[PDB]
Amino acid sequence: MMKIQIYGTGCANCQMLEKNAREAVKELGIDAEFEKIKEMDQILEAGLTALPGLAVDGELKIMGRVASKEEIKKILS
C-alpha cells in the first residue's frame, strides 16, 4: 500500500529504517512496497538533496540520515 523508495542502499544506511519501515508500515495497518533506487537519476528525481533519501507515497522527508524505528511509529502511530 505505502509506496516507499530508498535512495542510496550502499553508503545509505537506509537498511536500518528499511526493515523497521516494512514491519511498522504494514503492521501499522497498511502494507508498503519498498523498492530501492540505485541511481541518482532516480534519487534526485525524488527531490532529496542528500544520499539516504526516503520518499513515501510521493513525499520525501528523510535525507542524509534514514529515520529510526521509534521515529516511524511516532511519525505515524
Curated annotation (Swiss-Prot):
- Give the molecular function GO annotations: protein-disulfide reductase activity
Task: List the cysteine pairs that form cystine.
Answer: C11-C14
Q: Which InterPro entries match?
A: Thioredoxin-like_fold, Thioredoxin-like_sf, THIRX-like_proc
Q: Enumerate the UniProt keywords alphabetically.
A: Disulfide bond, Electron transport, Redox-active center, Transport
User: What residues form the catalytic site here?
Assistant: C11, C14
Q: Which Gene3D superfamilies match?
A: Glutaredoxin
General function of this protein: Does not function as a glutathione-disulfide oxidoreductase in the presence of glutathione and glutathione reductase. Has low thioredoxin activity in vitro.
Q: Which PANTHER family match?
A: THIOREDOXIN (PTHR36450:SF1)
Annotated family? Belongs to the glutaredoxin family.
Q: What is this protein called?
A: Thioredoxin
